[PDB]
Every structure is written in structure tokens, then in C-alpha cells.
Amino acid sequence: HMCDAFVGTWKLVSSENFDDYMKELGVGFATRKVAGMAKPNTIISVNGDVITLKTESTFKNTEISFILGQEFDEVTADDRKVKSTITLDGGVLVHVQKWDGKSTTLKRKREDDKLVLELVMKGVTCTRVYERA
Ligand SMILES: CCCCCCCCCCCCCC(=O)O
């Protein structure tokens, strides 16, 4: 039940400020050029308490599986080794990543028929809108 609203196959339809977000992350220029053009699919599924989130794109795929509230180690699309915790607060799936004394947040919520992803690092806010494939 908990994450039913998120389950599905979602395709990126719009993005704002992703370059600036990737810059704050430390992603290099070649990767930023590729990744700025990517239109990934995100596939969210659930098996009991275990949530899986796949991100697929031409250049790079990632997958994480997790239990809400339980820290896990993640290797990000840009090769960071982070400590991740994901919680569900008021319909918002909140993913925090911590590494090397830094933090970023990845927050997903439903907005009408869309899935909206907010990516925050320092002063940068990026907004990614996904629609059902
Ligand atoms: C899509 C290629 C991304 C490659 C490098 C940037 C990685 C940044 C962290 C990933 C942020 C998630 C973006 C998303 O799911 O839309």
C-alpha cells in the first residue's frame, strides 16, 4: 500500500537546473553534457517492505532497493559512494544521501498525474517532471 502512488514506469518530460545540480555534485563536463540531454525512465516497484527504484538511460542505468527508514550504501550514477536513507513523509518520498561531509536530497511527490522530483544540493534546486510511460 504505502508507495502505491509511486509504482509504475515513468519517463522524464521536463527538467530545470539539472546542470547546476550536477555541477554541485562534482560531475565533470563531459558527463554533464550527456546527462543533461538524457530522458531517463524511472521504474518503481514494491515487494512487501522493500521498494526498488530503477533509473534507465542510454548512457547509464542505476538501481536501488531499500526499506523505508533503513540506511543503505549506494553507488550513484556519477560514482559517488554514499550513505542513503529514504522515508515517506506526507506523500513525499525523501531520499537523503551523505558522503564526504556533504548532503543532497532527492524528493519525489505526486502532482496530479505527474511524478515530480526535486533535487537539492546547497543553493541549487532542480525540478524533474516525470509522466507515466
Ligand atoms: C541520467 C544520467 C545521470 C548521470 C550523472 C548525474 C547523476 C546525478 C545524480 C542522479 C540524479 C537523479 C536524476 C533523475 O532520476 O532524474
Which residue shows C-alpha cell 529514504? 86
- CA dist 4 → 12, 30, 44, 61, 121 (Å): 19, 37, 9, 23, 28
Domain ranges (residues) in the chain = 4-132
Classify residue 1 as exposed, middle or buried by CB count within 10 Å of its CB (0-12, 13-18, 19+). Answer: exposed
User: Are the C-beta atoms of 36 and 25 separated by less than 8 Å?
Assistant: no
Q: Which atom of ligand 1 is nearest to the CA of 12?
A: 16
Strands (DSSP E) contained in 7-91 are: 8-16, 41-47, 50-56, 61-67, 72-75, 81-89
User: Are the C-beta atoms of 6 and 93 separated by less than 8 Å?
Assistant: yes
- CA dist 51 → 20, 25, 70, 79 (Å): 29, 25, 12, 22
Beta bridge partners of 111: 114
Q: How many angstroms separate the CA atoms of 35 and 51, rounded?
A: 25
Helix (H, G, I), strand (E, B) or coil at 39: coil
Q: How many angstroms separate the CA atoms of 10 and 124, rounded?
A: 24
Q: Which atom of ligand 1 is nearest to the CA of 130?
A: 16
Topology of the domain covering 4-132: Lipocalin (2.40.128)
Q: How many angstroms separate the CA atoms of 60 and 62, rounded?
A: 7
Distance 34 CA to ligand 1 centre (A): 11
Q: Which amino acid is at 79?
A: D
User: Are the C-beta atoms of 116 and 6 separated by less than 8 Å?
Assistant: no
Ligand 1 environment, Cβ below 6 A: 12, 22, 25, 27, 31, 35, 38, 40, 42, 55, 57, 59-60, 76-78, 117, 119, 128
Helix (H, G, I), strand (E, B) or coil at 102: strand
User: Are the C-beta atoms of 128 and 106 separated by less than 8 Å?
Assistant: no
Which residue minimizes the CA distance to atom 9 of ligand 1?
Answer: 77
Beta bridge partners of 50: 47, 67
Contacts of 5 (CB under 8 A, 6+ apart): 91, 110
User: Are the C-beta atoms of 93 and 108 separated by less than 8 Å?
Assistant: yes
Known binding-site residues equal: 128-130
Resolution in A: 1.1
Tell me the best of 54, 63, 76, 109 to mutate to test the pocket of ligand 1, counting ligand atoms within 8 Å of each CB and taking the most: 76
